[PDB]
Amino acid sequence: SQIVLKKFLPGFMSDLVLAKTVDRQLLAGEINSSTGDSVSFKRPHQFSSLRTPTGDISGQNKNNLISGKATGRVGNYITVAVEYQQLEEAIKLNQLEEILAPVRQRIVTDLETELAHFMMNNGALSLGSPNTPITKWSDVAQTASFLKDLGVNEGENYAVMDPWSAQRLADAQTGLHASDQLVRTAWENAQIPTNFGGIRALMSNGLASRTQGAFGGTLTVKTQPTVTYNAVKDSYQFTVTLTGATASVTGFLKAGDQVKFTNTYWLQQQTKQALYNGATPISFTATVTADANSDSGGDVTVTLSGVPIYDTTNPQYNSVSRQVEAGDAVSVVGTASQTMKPNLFYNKFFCGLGSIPLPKLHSIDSAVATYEGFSIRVHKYADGDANVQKMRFDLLPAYVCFNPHMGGQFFGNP
Amino acid sequence: PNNLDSNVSQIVLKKFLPGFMSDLVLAKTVDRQLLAGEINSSTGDSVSFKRP
Amino acid sequence: PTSLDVTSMTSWEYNWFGADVIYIAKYYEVRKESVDVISYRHPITGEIAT
């Protein structure tokens, strides 16, 4: 009842795959003391052609030159702080080393959870119905096929799924017919290969989950929005208002919901031709960014990520077949208020990540802790005359969204 | 029309313009050897010198 | 008139009576300068002489 061991019991731990896959090259050591609190990148240029029988362009308009931007900003602090009575703390706990172990992993887990939230909030592409899980081989190959169909080449493509989904895919490998290595590996270790369907497939247990958000009624747009390139050449975000909703519901659309425009299709970005999904055209979709309520009269104003550019004076930047106008029909994927864990798929150049070094506070003892390439500043002080020491850990990340049309969520389809 | 204002950046140089300044004559002219090293905050707040 | 350097160093626990001392200092500098060397090459009694 008195004697105690000096070694703690083991605990539970998540895994980190999001940080190790996203781009950590372009945004690194760029938000310094001189840059400020934000930094921006450039965008590629696109040109259109004028077809004339004799080569005369005098009447027509030569291509104009418009430059875009992609801004990255800093986030909030990741701070964990504790206080203790040092007499009872130092009873058998030597040098306060036991606090160090479960705090860096807490910081890393929170950072990764917020990164996943940001990634699924800003992604535009969607595939399959949210209800259906992943059970077959095509459910993974569809993501790679879609990404190749859009036309992205420079980079690497990755897909992330929960532990159970890997087991269901692994069982399919056991039933293969001629590959001895594959069936033996799946039977013994239950490990799928690195490249599953042409896309680098990964497994992660810690994956953020979201709720749908209650909606009801045949939604449609009342006012033609502005989707000209000049308006959205800096953010790829646009605002739109809807009608036909329910009378008055708070939290009508949560963050991360996918709104699909039925009659507007995607385009092969280089050839500017429509996309055909084997038997049906692929419709345009957008992601909710901020929570939106509905007022009396059934009017919902929401901000969406991903723009259906159909500028008529700059045809070279089109990405959809037709211009979205009033009276169009839209729908929201999923059920009323179900909660599910989304599966993410993205290109290498979709979201960035970086860290801002933190200086030591004057006349306060401190140190640096490293954990998977993250530096954590630990500070100790003795405020108060009640023998209450305090220790705090800090970390300051920064995110950036390059192109919303290069990633998103995906599920299985029946 | 060409709208290419996002191709450049606003720059604030690392140069400081000259300021204003004063001069020191009164401090140099006074006698400083007599009072130097004669007053301590803990010991007291006054010193005395003897008249001829 | 005479202006002396100030150090505020001595008089630390000592009685001073002679205000007839002026403090002067010598200043030393080392510089890198360009100098032209002339090579008198008279062969008699040694030739190479720079």
mmCIF file with all atom_site columns, C-alpha atoms in Angstrom, chain A residues 109-287:
data_model
loop_
_atom_site.group_PDB
_atom_site.id
_atom_site.type_symbol
_atom_site.label_atom_id
_atom_site.label_alt_id
_atom_site.label_comp_id
_atom_site.label_asym_id
_atom_site.label_entity_id
_atom_site.label_seq_id
_atom_site.pdbx_PDB_ins_code
_atom_site.Cartn_x
_atom_site.Cartn_y
_atom_site.Cartn_z
_atom_site.occupancy
_atom_site.B_iso_or_equiv
_atom_site.pdbx_formal_charge
_atom_site.auth_seq_id
_atom_site.auth_comp_id
_atom_site.auth_asym_id
_atom_site.auth_atom_id
_atom_site.pdbx_PDB_model_num
ATOM 1   C CA . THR A 1 109 ? -1.899  15.433  -31.938 1.00 0.00 ? 109 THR A CA 1
ATOM 2   C CA . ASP A 1 110 ? -3.714  18.762  -31.624 1.00 0.00 ? 110 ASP A CA 1
ATOM 3   C CA . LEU A 1 111 ? -1.677  20.227  -34.482 1.00 0.00 ? 111 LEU A CA 1
ATOM 4   C CA . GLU A 1 112 ? -2.484  17.269  -36.732 1.00 0.00 ? 112 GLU A CA 1
ATOM 5   C CA . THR A 1 113 ? -6.188  17.321  -35.823 1.00 0.00 ? 113 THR A CA 1
ATOM 6   C CA . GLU A 1 114 ? -6.427  21.011  -36.693 1.00 0.00 ? 114 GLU A CA 1
ATOM 7   C CA . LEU A 1 115 ? -4.508  20.363  -39.921 1.00 0.00 ? 115 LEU A CA 1
ATOM 8   C CA . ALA A 1 116 ? -7.003  17.651  -40.894 1.00 0.00 ? 116 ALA A CA 1
ATOM 9   C CA . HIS A 1 117 ? -9.895  19.987  -40.075 1.00 0.00 ? 117 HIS A CA 1
ATOM 10  C CA . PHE A 1 118 ? -8.383  22.707  -42.277 1.00 0.00 ? 118 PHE A CA 1
ATOM 11  C CA . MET A 1 119 ? -7.698  20.245  -45.096 1.00 0.00 ? 119 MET A CA 1
ATOM 12  C CA . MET A 1 120 ? -11.238 18.888  -45.202 1.00 0.00 ? 120 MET A CA 1
ATOM 13  C CA . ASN A 1 121 ? -12.693 22.386  -44.791 1.00 0.00 ? 121 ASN A CA 1
ATOM 14  C CA . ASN A 1 122 ? -10.809 23.775  -47.798 1.00 0.00 ? 122 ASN A CA 1
ATOM 15  C CA . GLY A 1 123 ? -10.902 20.774  -50.141 1.00 0.00 ? 123 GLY A CA 1
ATOM 16  C CA . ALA A 1 124 ? -13.256 21.032  -53.110 1.00 0.00 ? 124 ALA A CA 1
ATOM 17  C CA . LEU A 1 125 ? -13.413 17.639  -54.837 1.00 0.00 ? 125 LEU A CA 1
ATOM 18  C CA . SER A 1 126 ? -15.880 14.997  -53.654 1.00 0.00 ? 126 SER A CA 1
ATOM 19  C CA . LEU A 1 127 ? -16.541 11.396  -54.660 1.00 0.00 ? 127 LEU A CA 1
ATOM 20  C CA . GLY A 1 128 ? -19.186 8.827   -53.794 1.00 0.00 ? 128 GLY A CA 1
ATOM 21  C CA . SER A 1 129 ? -21.929 9.027   -51.197 1.00 0.00 ? 129 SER A CA 1
ATOM 22  C CA . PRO A 1 130 ? -20.894 9.715   -47.581 1.00 0.00 ? 130 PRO A CA 1
ATOM 23  C CA . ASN A 1 131 ? -22.925 6.812   -46.180 1.00 0.00 ? 131 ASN A CA 1
ATOM 24  C CA . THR A 1 132 ? -21.210 4.012   -48.081 1.00 0.00 ? 132 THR A CA 1
ATOM 25  C CA . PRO A 1 133 ? -17.835 2.873   -46.674 1.00 0.00 ? 133 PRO A CA 1
ATOM 26  C CA . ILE A 1 134 ? -14.858 1.476   -48.609 1.00 0.00 ? 134 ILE A CA 1
ATOM 27  C CA . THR A 1 135 ? -15.132 -2.236  -49.335 1.00 0.00 ? 135 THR A CA 1
ATOM 28  C CA . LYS A 1 136 ? -13.755 -2.922  -52.822 1.00 0.00 ? 136 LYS A CA 1
ATOM 29  C CA . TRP A 1 137 ? -10.739 -2.179  -55.021 1.00 0.00 ? 137 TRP A CA 1
ATOM 30  C CA . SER A 1 138 ? -12.463 0.439   -57.187 1.00 0.00 ? 138 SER A CA 1
ATOM 31  C CA . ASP A 1 139 ? -13.204 2.671   -54.184 1.00 0.00 ? 139 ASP A CA 1
ATOM 32  C CA . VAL A 1 140 ? -9.509  3.608   -54.031 1.00 0.00 ? 140 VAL A CA 1
ATOM 33  C CA . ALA A 1 141 ? -8.737  3.570   -57.754 1.00 0.00 ? 141 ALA A CA 1
ATOM 34  C CA . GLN A 1 142 ? -11.489 6.126   -58.392 1.00 0.00 ? 142 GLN A CA 1
ATOM 35  C CA . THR A 1 143 ? -9.476  8.829   -56.603 1.00 0.00 ? 143 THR A CA 1
ATOM 36  C CA . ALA A 1 144 ? -6.380  8.268   -58.739 1.00 0.00 ? 144 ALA A CA 1
ATOM 37  C CA . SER A 1 145 ? -8.497  8.114   -61.894 1.00 0.00 ? 145 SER A CA 1
ATOM 38  C CA . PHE A 1 146 ? -10.206 11.412  -61.026 1.00 0.00 ? 146 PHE A CA 1
ATOM 39  C CA . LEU A 1 147 ? -6.921  13.147  -60.213 1.00 0.00 ? 147 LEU A CA 1
ATOM 40  C CA . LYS A 1 148 ? -5.403  11.967  -63.496 1.00 0.00 ? 148 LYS A CA 1
ATOM 41  C CA . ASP A 1 149 ? -8.582  13.049  -65.300 1.00 0.00 ? 149 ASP A CA 1
ATOM 42  C CA . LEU A 1 150 ? -8.311  16.623  -64.023 1.00 0.00 ? 150 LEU A CA 1
ATOM 43  C CA . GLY A 1 151 ? -4.774  16.804  -65.388 1.00 0.00 ? 151 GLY A CA 1
ATOM 44  C CA . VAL A 1 152 ? -2.407  17.124  -62.433 1.00 0.00 ? 152 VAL A CA 1
ATOM 45  C CA . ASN A 1 153 ? 1.050   15.726  -63.211 1.00 0.00 ? 153 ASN A CA 1
ATOM 46  C CA . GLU A 1 154 ? 3.745   17.535  -61.194 1.00 0.00 ? 154 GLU A CA 1
ATOM 47  C CA . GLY A 1 155 ? 3.670   16.057  -57.671 1.00 0.00 ? 155 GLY A CA 1
ATOM 48  C CA . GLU A 1 156 ? 2.722   12.841  -55.805 1.00 0.00 ? 156 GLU A CA 1
ATOM 49  C CA . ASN A 1 157 ? -0.872  11.717  -55.026 1.00 0.00 ? 157 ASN A CA 1
ATOM 50  C CA . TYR A 1 158 ? -1.821  10.295  -51.566 1.00 0.00 ? 158 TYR A CA 1
ATOM 51  C CA . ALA A 1 159 ? -5.012  8.755   -50.028 1.00 0.00 ? 159 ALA A CA 1
ATOM 52  C CA . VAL A 1 160 ? -5.658  8.272   -46.256 1.00 0.00 ? 160 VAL A CA 1
ATOM 53  C CA . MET A 1 161 ? -8.172  5.821   -44.649 1.00 0.00 ? 161 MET A CA 1
ATOM 54  C CA . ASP A 1 162 ? -9.059  4.448   -41.155 1.00 0.00 ? 162 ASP A CA 1
ATOM 55  C CA . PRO A 1 163 ? -7.793  1.080   -39.790 1.00 0.00 ? 163 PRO A CA 1
ATOM 56  C CA . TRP A 1 164 ? -10.966 -0.970  -40.468 1.00 0.00 ? 164 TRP A CA 1
ATOM 57  C CA . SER A 1 165 ? -11.158 0.066   -44.162 1.00 0.00 ? 165 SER A CA 1
ATOM 58  C CA . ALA A 1 166 ? -7.634  -1.288  -44.715 1.00 0.00 ? 166 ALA A CA 1
ATOM 59  C CA . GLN A 1 167 ? -8.714  -4.667  -43.201 1.00 0.00 ? 167 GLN A CA 1
ATOM 60  C CA . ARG A 1 168 ? -11.668 -4.944  -45.626 1.00 0.00 ? 168 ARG A CA 1
ATOM 61  C CA . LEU A 1 169 ? -9.359  -4.178  -48.606 1.00 0.00 ? 169 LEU A CA 1
ATOM 62  C CA . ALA A 1 170 ? -6.714  -6.606  -47.167 1.00 0.00 ? 170 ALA A CA 1
ATOM 63  C CA . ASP A 1 171 ? -9.277  -9.471  -47.146 1.00 0.00 ? 171 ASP A CA 1
ATOM 64  C CA . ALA A 1 172 ? -9.840  -8.899  -50.904 1.00 0.00 ? 172 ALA A CA 1
ATOM 65  C CA . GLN A 1 173 ? -6.080  -9.396  -51.464 1.00 0.00 ? 173 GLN A CA 1
ATOM 66  C CA . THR A 1 174 ? -6.256  -12.754 -49.592 1.00 0.00 ? 174 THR A CA 1
ATOM 67  C CA . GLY A 1 175 ? -8.768  -13.902 -52.240 1.00 0.00 ? 175 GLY A CA 1
ATOM 68  C CA . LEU A 1 176 ? -6.487  -13.044 -55.158 1.00 0.00 ? 176 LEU A CA 1
ATOM 69  C CA . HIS A 1 177 ? -5.895  -15.747 -57.739 1.00 0.00 ? 177 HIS A CA 1
ATOM 70  C CA . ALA A 1 178 ? -2.297  -15.705 -58.988 1.00 0.00 ? 178 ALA A CA 1
ATOM 71  C CA . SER A 1 179 ? -0.023  -13.328 -57.008 1.00 0.00 ? 179 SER A CA 1
ATOM 72  C CA . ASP A 1 180 ? 1.761   -15.402 -54.369 1.00 0.00 ? 180 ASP A CA 1
ATOM 73  C CA . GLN A 1 181 ? 3.600   -12.539 -52.652 1.00 0.00 ? 181 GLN A CA 1
ATOM 74  C CA . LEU A 1 182 ? 0.452   -10.421 -52.359 1.00 0.00 ? 182 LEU A CA 1
ATOM 75  C CA . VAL A 1 183 ? -1.732  -13.193 -50.940 1.00 0.00 ? 183 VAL A CA 1
ATOM 76  C CA . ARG A 1 184 ? 0.965   -14.374 -48.528 1.00 0.00 ? 184 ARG A CA 1
ATOM 77  C CA . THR A 1 185 ? 1.589   -10.854 -47.214 1.00 0.00 ? 185 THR A CA 1
ATOM 78  C CA . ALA A 1 186 ? -2.130  -10.137 -46.839 1.00 0.00 ? 186 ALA A CA 1
ATOM 79  C CA . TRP A 1 187 ? -2.749  -13.474 -45.104 1.00 0.00 ? 187 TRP A CA 1
ATOM 80  C CA . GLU A 1 188 ? 0.105   -13.071 -42.620 1.00 0.00 ? 188 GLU A CA 1
ATOM 81  C CA . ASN A 1 189 ? 0.614   -9.370  -41.868 1.00 0.00 ? 189 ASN A CA 1
ATOM 82  C CA . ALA A 1 190 ? -2.688  -7.934  -43.192 1.00 0.00 ? 190 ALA A CA 1
ATOM 83  C CA . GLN A 1 191 ? -0.667  -5.185  -44.898 1.00 0.00 ? 191 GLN A CA 1
ATOM 84  C CA . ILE A 1 192 ? -1.740  -3.738  -48.250 1.00 0.00 ? 192 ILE A CA 1
ATOM 85  C CA . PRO A 1 193 ? 1.046   -2.695  -50.665 1.00 0.00 ? 193 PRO A CA 1
ATOM 86  C CA . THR A 1 194 ? 2.336   0.871   -50.860 1.00 0.00 ? 194 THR A CA 1
ATOM 87  C CA . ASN A 1 195 ? 0.692   1.724   -54.198 1.00 0.00 ? 195 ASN A CA 1
ATOM 88  C CA . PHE A 1 196 ? -2.977  0.670   -54.173 1.00 0.00 ? 196 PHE A CA 1
ATOM 89  C CA . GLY A 1 197 ? -4.660  1.506   -57.469 1.00 0.00 ? 197 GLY A CA 1
ATOM 90  C CA . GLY A 1 198 ? -1.972  3.900   -58.698 1.00 0.00 ? 198 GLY A CA 1
ATOM 91  C CA . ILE A 1 199 ? -2.178  6.157   -55.624 1.00 0.00 ? 199 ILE A CA 1
ATOM 92  C CA . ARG A 1 200 ? 0.018   5.995   -52.523 1.00 0.00 ? 200 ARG A CA 1
ATOM 93  C CA . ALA A 1 201 ? -2.391  4.546   -49.962 1.00 0.00 ? 201 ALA A CA 1
ATOM 94  C CA . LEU A 1 202 ? -1.882  5.060   -46.233 1.00 0.00 ? 202 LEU A CA 1
ATOM 95  C CA . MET A 1 203 ? -3.547  4.029   -42.976 1.00 0.00 ? 203 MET A CA 1
ATOM 96  C CA . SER A 1 204 ? -4.156  6.286   -39.975 1.00 0.00 ? 204 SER A CA 1
ATOM 97  C CA . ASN A 1 205 ? -6.121  5.817   -36.762 1.00 0.00 ? 205 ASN A CA 1
ATOM 98  C CA . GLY A 1 206 ? -6.355  9.469   -35.726 1.00 0.00 ? 206 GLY A CA 1
ATOM 99  C CA . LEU A 1 207 ? -8.613  11.102  -38.300 1.00 0.00 ? 207 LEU A CA 1
ATOM 100 C CA . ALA A 1 208 ? -10.947 14.015  -37.632 1.00 0.00 ? 208 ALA A CA 1
ATOM 101 C CA . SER A 1 209 ? -14.704 13.462  -37.768 1.00 0.00 ? 209 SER A CA 1
ATOM 102 C CA . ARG A 1 210 ? -17.550 15.826  -38.601 1.00 0.00 ? 210 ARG A CA 1
ATOM 103 C CA . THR A 1 211 ? -21.336 16.086  -38.538 1.00 0.00 ? 211 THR A CA 1
ATOM 104 C CA . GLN A 1 212 ? -23.592 16.801  -41.507 1.00 0.00 ? 212 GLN A CA 1
ATOM 105 C CA . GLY A 1 213 ? -25.957 19.507  -40.261 1.00 0.00 ? 213 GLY A CA 1
ATOM 106 C CA . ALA A 1 214 ? -29.738 19.551  -40.553 1.00 0.00 ? 214 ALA A CA 1
ATOM 107 C CA . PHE A 1 215 ? -31.202 20.664  -43.887 1.00 0.00 ? 215 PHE A CA 1
ATOM 108 C CA . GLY A 1 216 ? -34.518 20.270  -45.665 1.00 0.00 ? 216 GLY A CA 1
ATOM 109 C CA . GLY A 1 217 ? -36.237 21.406  -48.848 1.00 0.00 ? 217 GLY A CA 1
ATOM 110 C CA . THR A 1 218 ? -35.387 21.703  -52.540 1.00 0.00 ? 218 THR A CA 1
ATOM 111 C CA . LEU A 1 219 ? -32.630 24.309  -52.544 1.00 0.00 ? 219 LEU A CA 1
ATOM 112 C CA . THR A 1 220 ? -32.057 26.677  -55.456 1.00 0.00 ? 220 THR A CA 1
ATOM 113 C CA . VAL A 1 221 ? -30.151 29.907  -56.044 1.00 0.00 ? 221 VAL A CA 1
ATOM 114 C CA . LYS A 1 222 ? -32.034 33.209  -56.236 1.00 0.00 ? 222 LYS A CA 1
ATOM 115 C CA . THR A 1 223 ? -29.328 35.592  -57.486 1.00 0.00 ? 223 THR A CA 1
ATOM 116 C CA . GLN A 1 224 ? -26.644 35.083  -60.101 1.00 0.00 ? 224 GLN A CA 1
ATOM 117 C CA . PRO A 1 225 ? -23.283 35.263  -58.283 1.00 0.00 ? 225 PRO A CA 1
ATOM 118 C CA . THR A 1 226 ? -20.087 36.895  -59.520 1.00 0.00 ? 226 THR A CA 1
ATOM 119 C CA . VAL A 1 227 ? -17.564 34.266  -60.620 1.00 0.00 ? 227 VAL A CA 1
ATOM 120 C CA . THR A 1 228 ? -15.369 36.457  -62.809 1.00 0.00 ? 228 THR A CA 1
ATOM 121 C CA . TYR A 1 229 ? -11.653 35.766  -62.551 1.00 0.00 ? 229 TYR A CA 1
ATOM 122 C CA . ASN A 1 230 ? -10.806 39.281  -61.336 1.00 0.00 ? 230 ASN A CA 1
ATOM 123 C CA . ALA A 1 231 ? -13.045 38.778  -58.300 1.00 0.00 ? 231 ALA A CA 1
ATOM 124 C CA . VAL A 1 232 ? -11.594 35.383  -57.346 1.00 0.00 ? 232 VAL A CA 1
ATOM 125 C CA . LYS A 1 233 ? -7.993  35.698  -58.579 1.00 0.00 ? 233 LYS A CA 1
ATOM 126 C CA . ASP A 1 234 ? -6.701  35.830  -54.992 1.00 0.00 ? 234 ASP A CA 1
ATOM 127 C CA . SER A 1 235 ? -8.698  33.336  -52.921 1.00 0.00 ? 235 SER A CA 1
ATOM 128 C CA . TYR A 1 236 ? -10.836 30.992  -55.084 1.00 0.00 ? 236 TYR A CA 1
ATOM 129 C CA . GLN A 1 237 ? -13.765 31.654  -52.750 1.00 0.00 ? 237 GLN A CA 1
ATOM 130 C CA . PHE A 1 238 ? -17.184 33.004  -53.665 1.00 0.00 ? 238 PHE A CA 1
ATOM 131 C CA . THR A 1 239 ? -20.447 33.742  -51.871 1.00 0.00 ? 239 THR A CA 1
ATOM 132 C CA . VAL A 1 240 ? -23.920 32.607  -52.928 1.00 0.00 ? 240 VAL A CA 1
ATOM 133 C CA . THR A 1 241 ? -27.440 32.761  -51.497 1.00 0.00 ? 241 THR A CA 1
ATOM 134 C CA . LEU A 1 242 ? -30.055 30.010  -51.697 1.00 0.00 ? 242 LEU A CA 1
ATOM 135 C CA . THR A 1 243 ? -33.844 29.655  -51.532 1.00 0.00 ? 243 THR A CA 1
ATOM 136 C CA . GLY A 1 244 ? -36.320 26.850  -50.970 1.00 0.00 ? 244 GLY A CA 1
ATOM 137 C CA . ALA A 1 245 ? -34.882 25.959  -47.564 1.00 0.00 ? 245 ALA A CA 1
ATOM 138 C CA . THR A 1 246 ? -36.684 25.269  -44.283 1.00 0.00 ? 246 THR A CA 1
ATOM 139 C CA . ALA A 1 247 ? -38.458 28.065  -42.389 1.00 0.00 ? 247 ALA A CA 1
ATOM 140 C CA . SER A 1 248 ? -35.843 28.934  -39.742 1.00 0.00 ? 248 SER A CA 1
ATOM 141 C CA . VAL A 1 249 ? -33.091 26.492  -38.740 1.00 0.00 ? 249 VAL A CA 1
ATOM 142 C CA . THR A 1 250 ? -29.938 27.435  -36.846 1.00 0.00 ? 250 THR A CA 1
ATOM 143 C CA . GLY A 1 251 ? -26.832 25.671  -38.070 1.00 0.00 ? 251 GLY A CA 1
ATOM 144 C CA . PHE A 1 252 ? -28.428 24.819  -41.412 1.00 0.00 ? 252 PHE A CA 1
ATOM 145 C CA . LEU A 1 253 ? -25.072 23.928  -43.006 1.00 0.00 ? 253 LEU A CA 1
ATOM 146 C CA . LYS A 1 254 ? -22.004 22.966  -40.993 1.00 0.00 ? 254 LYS A CA 1
ATOM 147 C CA . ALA A 1 255 ? -18.377 23.436  -42.034 1.00 0.00 ? 255 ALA A CA 1
ATOM 148 C CA . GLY A 1 256 ? -17.167 20.892  -44.591 1.00 0.00 ? 256 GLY A CA 1
ATOM 149 C CA . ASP A 1 257 ? -20.502 20.160  -46.286 1.00 0.00 ? 257 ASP A CA 1
ATOM 150 C CA . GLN A 1 258 ? -20.436 19.592  -50.046 1.00 0.00 ? 258 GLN A CA 1
ATOM 151 C CA . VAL A 1 259 ? -22.884 21.514  -52.247 1.00 0.00 ? 259 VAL A CA 1
ATOM 152 C CA . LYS A 1 260 ? -23.298 20.089  -55.747 1.00 0.00 ? 260 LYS A CA 1
ATOM 153 C CA . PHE A 1 261 ? -24.466 22.028  -58.812 1.00 0.00 ? 261 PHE A CA 1
ATOM 154 C CA . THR A 1 262 ? -26.395 19.604  -61.000 1.00 0.00 ? 262 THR A CA 1
ATOM 155 C CA . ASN A 1 263 ? -26.155 21.137  -64.473 1.00 0.00 ? 263 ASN A CA 1
ATOM 156 C CA . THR A 1 264 ? -22.614 22.597  -64.330 1.00 0.00 ? 264 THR A CA 1
ATOM 157 C CA . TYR A 1 265 ? -19.815 20.162  -65.166 1.00 0.00 ? 265 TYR A CA 1
ATOM 158 C CA . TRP A 1 266 ? -16.072 20.080  -64.589 1.00 0.00 ? 266 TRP A CA 1
ATOM 159 C CA . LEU A 1 267 ? -13.581 20.611  -67.409 1.00 0.00 ? 267 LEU A CA 1
ATOM 160 C CA . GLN A 1 268 ? -10.239 19.177  -68.399 1.00 0.00 ? 268 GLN A CA 1
ATOM 161 C CA . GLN A 1 269 ? -8.320  22.292  -67.447 1.00 0.00 ? 269 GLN A CA 1
ATOM 162 C CA . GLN A 1 270 ? -5.960  22.268  -70.429 1.00 0.00 ? 270 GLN A CA 1
ATOM 163 C CA . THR A 1 271 ? -8.299  21.154  -73.216 1.00 0.00 ? 271 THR A CA 1
ATOM 164 C CA . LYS A 1 272 ? -11.345 22.893  -71.665 1.00 0.00 ? 272 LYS A CA 1
ATOM 165 C CA . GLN A 1 273 ? -13.572 19.901  -72.485 1.00 0.00 ? 273 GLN A CA 1
ATOM 166 C CA . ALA A 1 274 ? -16.279 18.339  -70.339 1.00 0.00 ? 274 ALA A CA 1
ATOM 167 C CA . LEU A 1 275 ? -15.646 15.417  -67.986 1.00 0.00 ? 275 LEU A CA 1
ATOM 168 C CA . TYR A 1 276 ? -17.441 12.103  -68.512 1.00 0.00 ? 276 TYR A CA 1
ATOM 169 C CA . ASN A 1 277 ? -17.669 9.585   -65.658 1.00 0.00 ? 277 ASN A CA 1
ATOM 170 C CA . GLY A 1 278 ? -18.170 6.488   -67.774 1.00 0.00 ? 278 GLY A CA 1
ATOM 171 C CA . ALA A 1 279 ? -21.950 6.864   -67.915 1.00 0.00 ? 279 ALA A CA 1
ATOM 172 C CA . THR A 1 280 ? -22.744 10.359  -66.567 1.00 0.00 ? 280 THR A CA 1
ATOM 173 C CA . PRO A 1 281 ? -21.005 13.750  -66.602 1.00 0.00 ? 281 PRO A CA 1
ATOM 174 C CA . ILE A 1 282 ? -19.225 14.909  -63.461 1.00 0.00 ? 282 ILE A CA 1
ATOM 175 C CA . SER A 1 283 ? -21.019 17.757  -61.709 1.00 0.00 ? 283 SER A CA 1
ATOM 176 C CA . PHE A 1 284 ? -19.356 20.720  -60.012 1.00 0.00 ? 284 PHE A CA 1
ATOM 177 C CA . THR A 1 285 ? -19.145 20.816  -56.218 1.00 0.00 ? 285 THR A CA 1
ATOM 178 C CA . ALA A 1 286 ? -18.049 23.225  -53.486 1.00 0.00 ? 286 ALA A CA 1
ATOM 179 C CA . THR A 1 287 ? -17.278 23.074  -49.770 1.00 0.00 ? 287 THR A CA 1
#
